[PDB]
Amino acid sequence: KIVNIGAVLSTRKHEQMFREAVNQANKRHGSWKIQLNATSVTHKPNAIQMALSVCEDLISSQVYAILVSHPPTPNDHFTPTPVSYTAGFYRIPVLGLTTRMSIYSDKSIHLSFLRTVPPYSHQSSVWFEMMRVYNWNHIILLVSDDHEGRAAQKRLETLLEERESKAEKVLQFDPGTKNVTALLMEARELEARVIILSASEDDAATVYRAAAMLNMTGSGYVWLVGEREISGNALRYAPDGIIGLQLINGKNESAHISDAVGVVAQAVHELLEKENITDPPRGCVGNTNIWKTGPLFKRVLMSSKYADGVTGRVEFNEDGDRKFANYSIMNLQNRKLVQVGIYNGTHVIPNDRKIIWPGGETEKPRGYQMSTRLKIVTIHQEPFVYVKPTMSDGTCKEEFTVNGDPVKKV
Amino acid sequence: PALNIAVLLGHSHDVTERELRNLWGPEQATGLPLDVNVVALLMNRTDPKSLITHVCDLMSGARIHGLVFGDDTDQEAVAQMLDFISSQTFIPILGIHGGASMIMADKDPTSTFFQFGASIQQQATVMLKIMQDYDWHVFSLVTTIFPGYRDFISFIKTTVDNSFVGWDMQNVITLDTSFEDAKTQVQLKKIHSSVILLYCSKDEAVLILSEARSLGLTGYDFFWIVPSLVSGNTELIPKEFPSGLISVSYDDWDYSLEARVRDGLGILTTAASSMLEKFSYIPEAKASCYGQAEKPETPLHTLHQFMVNVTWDGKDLSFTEEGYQVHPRLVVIVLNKDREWEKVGKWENQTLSLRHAVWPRYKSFSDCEPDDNHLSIVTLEEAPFVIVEDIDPLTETCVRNTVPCRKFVK
Amino acid sequence: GWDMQNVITLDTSFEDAKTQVQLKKIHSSVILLYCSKDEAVLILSEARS
Amino acid sequence: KFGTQERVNNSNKKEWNGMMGELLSGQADMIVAPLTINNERAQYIEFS
Amino acid sequence: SDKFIYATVKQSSVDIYFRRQVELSTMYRHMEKHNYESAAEAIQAVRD
């Protein structure tokens, strides 16, 4: 009757409020018999320590779903992975709270991971909407070589294929490269002025400084970036006029904990409404078979709509994310991020604020600047293209036809 | 210097630890600058906590510098667990058998984990080689939202675009959901008589095959080629699988587990020998799983980049950057009239050798129509009327306006 | 020319087995349906399905 | 070379040589030369 | 025939036309081993 829920959280206070949210969800729509419980564990510095902790504390406690969140330490190098892969052995669903990496979106690797925060790779959708609003047809992608940049590029290319169009160049740079001037020099020779960046904070700062050195932040250029490129060190060197994105509740662990607890409680009640439910296993050691109702529990989680949500309407897509998040469009004016619009679950709406494009101009710059210098290629065909050696001075002789007109040479 | 290599197998396999130790006793100076003292150990079942304890208890005791883990069950979550034991311990782990042998899409960049399996790209390559050998150019490629669909479709489209063969890809049906419900039947009706590259799980493919038989999509003129995802466990075969259902899979008949462990030990020994030839000495193994060492966990030299060039006595066992075998041991199996997966062809050094020069027509079901439209035609080569020529070097098949024809030459 | 492709005779069980397989052999072409009004309603619902 | 689809040795990749390789790779923007119009060339570039 | 040798420019439009044509493949095989690098070289070879 009692349904246990585990919570991998960051601080004792957050676990106390997780218990409070569990109690609140228990009070409302309890299905007349089920009384949910709540067990919580603080994140551990080492991944192996956490794997053993979740095996011993959560898994042995008959947890139906596990709530995981980033530790208070600023490092965010895939902390919830051991949770998703200890609870993924038995198809026990895992609830991510502040994990925005796109690697978890692939279900072939993460079998039973669902997050409340959509990952960074969905930001590309916003850019396409902007490409639909400001009529930008030629863009340049500046993506990392890791999984996140590749996923963002793939999503943007999939979106663009519907329009029968493609980015002129998709420059991939390895993470942590100190010198990126070669790629930006290559991009400068192109025509498109819509530069789209998808990189971590350090890589975003490096790209920003390299663009500043190359005078790429001036007038006629427009930059579209994500949340990682306008936060932290990347904000220090961000060029003025950049169009960043921010999540309304991305760092609000409170609202995420509350809505995740509500959704998981509703899903547990919906599952217990059905038939042939098996009980969760005890302990990692001694049990090897998967949880039979794991797949259907994840499916019922993915089909539950949380009507009244603190973060908004909570939904789930086939990739396992929220699919509906509010992205706030932040423009960097006078070295200060000011909101110039907000992107809802499906559309972008501007506000009374005026967008200051890079270089300080108010008018919307054109997508590209046409090149009046053309690289002409020819071959040595005798009747059509005679080719002759030039003199020492560098220009060959003037010649005249039978009429006497000069023969034009290049 | 002595190389400690650990081997871990399940109890379902009759091979004992002493046999594993004796396997590395050929005594022909296998390691020129080093000697390998193989340590063996078994576990009752595969599970996170026990697996971690076993792995770094072996690390603490035998000071192992490698792992040749081999699983017995079909749990696909073991491969990831091994991958990130390798990630958080820097021990080169090899997935030999069972769930650890199933290819995982994206691995951690800092994890030295390699698998004895074939990625979906290699299976698609083998399937296209089958079609090229049998001239089954027309094909309808059915998919689903079963993860990895996008990679399979992207690779098949890229190969088709780069292909010199016709490859009239008629359609791509993505049965999003509701297989036995509306709007998927209408999707299936657009299928024309052609090869079907079904891509989904085994039970879901059972559902789609039941629907297809209800729609009359199985017969002498209907061919189905499928990857190892749906063939799955050869021992159990669904009643909905038509006879002649061609599939490709890693060989479990000829590639015995003893050969698997010998190949893993040989790979590790050759990589370490190349390291000794190139670098200074064998790096000491990590202290343990635990302790939270205050160091940015970066070994000076590792086995990661030296596994791309590993050669054994008679075969090449190199690995790609993503972690797949460059020369996997793939076999093309078919479901014969006895409802058993009979191995037909093999994949050796990028060449597919097929037992049947001409494809023997297989009765799909008991109620299928008799084979009449298929006829054997004798034709002896006479200069002006019928001409026999060799295979096209450019296309590796019969040229335009020319038909395949087989001569029995001694 | 008049390439009469096929003659499907839906003996019975219009919304049941072995008539669907009969209907699958239909190719894109003119259909000279011959039946009562309500039965033709059933066959047309199946055809739209 | 004027340009022809050729299969490069590594990975068996289709590639354009000569003028088509120069133009499709961005090295050149226009080809003013006796370039014949046919399907293989017209599928990737566009002729006046 | 061996005594009658004829060719064209390697990797050009006419080479593609002969490769893709359904029936002239028998002489395309002959031409593949005598193709010249440039039109001027082939013209000079014809001249002498």
UniProtKB/Swiss-Prot annotation, chain A:
Glycans are attached at N37, N179, N215, N252, N276, N326, N344. Heterotetramer; the NMDAR subunits are modular and harbor tiered domains that function in concert to regulate opening and closing of the cation-selective ion channel pore. Forms heterotetrameric channels composed of two GluN1/zeta subunits (GRIN1), and two identical GluN2/epsilon subunits (GRIN2A, GRIN2B, GRIN2C or GRIN2D) or GluN3 subunits (GRIN3A or GRIN3B) (in vitro). Can also form heterotetrameric channels that contain at least two GluN1 subunits and at least two different GluN2 subunits (or a combination of one GluN2 and one GluN3 subunits) (in vitro). Disulfide bonds join C55-C284. Detected throughout the brain, in brain cortex, cerebellum, thalamus and olfactory bulb. It is found in: Cell membrane; Postsynaptic cell membrane; Synaptic cell membrane; Postsynaptic density membrane. Residues 1-410 are extracellular. Belongs to the glutamate-gated ion channel (TC 1.A.10.1) family. NR1/GRIN1 subfamily. NMDA is probably regulated by C-terminal phosphorylation of an isoform of NR1 by PKC. Its phosphorylated state is influenced by the formation of the NMDAR-PPP2CB complex and the NMDAR channel activity. The chain holds residues 25 to 434 of 938 of the full protein. This is Glutamate receptor ionotropic, NMDA 1. The gene is Grin1. A hydrophobic region that gives rise to the prediction of a transmembrane span does not cross the membrane, but is part of a discontinuously helical region that dips into the membrane and is probably part of the pore and of the selectivity filter. The extracellular N-terminal domain (ATD) is a site of allosteric regulation to modulate overall receptor function.
Swiss-Prot record, chain B:
Component of N-methyl-D-aspartate (NMDA) receptors (NMDARs) that function as heterotetrameric, ligand-gated cation channels with high calcium permeability and voltage-dependent block by Mg(2+). NMDARs participate in synaptic plasticity for learning and memory formation by contributing to the slow phase of excitatory postsynaptic current, long-term synaptic potentiation, and learning. The lineage of its organism: Eukaryota, Metazoa, Chordata, Craniata, Vertebrata. Residues 1-410 are extracellular. Belongs to the glutamate-gated ion channel (TC 1.A.10.1) family. NR2A/GRIN2A subfamily. Disulfide bonds join C56-C289. Zn(2+) binds at H13, H97, E235, D251. This is Glutamate receptor ionotropic, NMDA 2A. The gene is Grin2a. Coiled coil: none annotated. It is found in: Cell projection, Dendritic spine; Cell membrane; Synapse; Postsynaptic cell membrane. Contains an N-terminal domain, a ligand-binding domain and a transmembrane domain. Agonist binding to the extracellular ligand-binding domains triggers channel gating. Glycans are attached at N44, N309. Detected in brain cortex, olfactory bulb, hippocampus including the dentate gyrus, striatum, thalamus, superior colliculus, inferior colliculus, midbrain and cerebellum (at protein level). Detected in brain cortex, hypothalamus and cerebellum. Changing K202 to A/R: Nearly abolishes inhibition by Zn(2+). It comes from Rattus norvegicus (Rat).
UniProtKB/Swiss-Prot annotation, chain C:
Changing K37 to A/R: Nearly abolishes inhibition by Zn(2+). It comes from the Eukaryota. Coiled coil: none annotated. It is found in: Cell projection, Dendritic spine; Cell membrane; Synapse; Postsynaptic cell membrane. Detected in brain cortex, olfactory bulb, hippocampus including the dentate gyrus, striatum, thalamus, superior colliculus, inferior colliculus, midbrain and cerebellum (at protein level). Detected in brain cortex, hypothalamus and cerebellum. Heterotetramer. Forms heterotetrameric channels composed of two GluN1/zeta subunits (GRIN1), and two identical GluN2/epsilon subunits (GRIN2A, GRIN2B, GRIN2C or GRIN2D) or GluN3 subunits (GRIN3A or GRIN3B) (in vitro). Can also form heterotetrameric channels that contain at least two GluN1 subunits and at least two different GluN2 subunits (or a combination of one GluN2 and one GluN3 subunits) (in vitro). In vivo, the subunit composition may depend on the expression levels of the different subunits. Found in a complex with GRIN1, GRIN3A and PPP2CB. Found in a complex with GRIN1 and GRIN3B. Belongs to the glutamate-gated ion channel (TC 1.A.10.1) family. NR2A/GRIN2A subfamily. Component of N-methyl-D-aspartate (NMDA) receptors (NMDARs) that function as heterotetrameric, ligand-gated cation channels with high calcium permeability and voltage-dependent block by Mg(2+). NMDARs participate in synaptic plasticity for learning and memory formation by contributing to the slow phase of excitatory postsynaptic current, long-term synaptic potentiation, and learning. This is Glutamate receptor ionotropic, NMDA 2A. It comes from Rattus norvegicus. The chain holds residues 197 to 245 of 1464 of the full protein.
